[PDB]
Amino acid sequence: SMEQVAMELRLTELTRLLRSVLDQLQDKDPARIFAQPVSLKEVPDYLDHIKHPMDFATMRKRLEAQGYKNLHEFEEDFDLIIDNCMKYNARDTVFYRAAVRLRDQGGVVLRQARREVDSIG
Known part of the structure; x- marks a missing residue:
């Protein structure tokens, strides 16, 4: 149908x-800490700690399958x-600190994306 x-x-x-949003957010992670899934070879107990792992490569796969229906998802x-990251890693780690900077910096990008999605329908 039409x-x-x-x-x-x-x-x-x-x-x-x-x-475009994903590219902008990923630029706020220049160390590439969040680029790929945490390795279950290198962190064999990870899934005992973290029930729903996520990373930027995994988001990119979902995106390219048009797997996001809206910005909320x-x-x-x-x-x-x-x-x-903020649960698995302690406060005094490069990992935790990288997540805090990603959160703070990404908030700006996401604030305007919300407006662009509401605006352009």
Whole structure:
């Protein structure tokens, strides 16, 4: 139907905007701490600690499958990256500190993305 196509165009355009959002957020992680899944070879007990792992590569796979229906879903996954790190790692670690800086810096990017998604429908 024409309605299904129109909805598919809306999803494609959301995916384009979320792709730019993801690039901007990932630039705020220049050390690449959050680039890939925590390795279960190197941290074999990770899943005993963290029930829903997340990382930027895993978000990118979901994005390119047009797997985000709205910005809330995408933010949920970004928040898991931060929140998982801040639980697994102690305050006095490079990992925790990197998450705090990602959170603070990403908030700015996400504040305007919310406006762009509400504005452009």
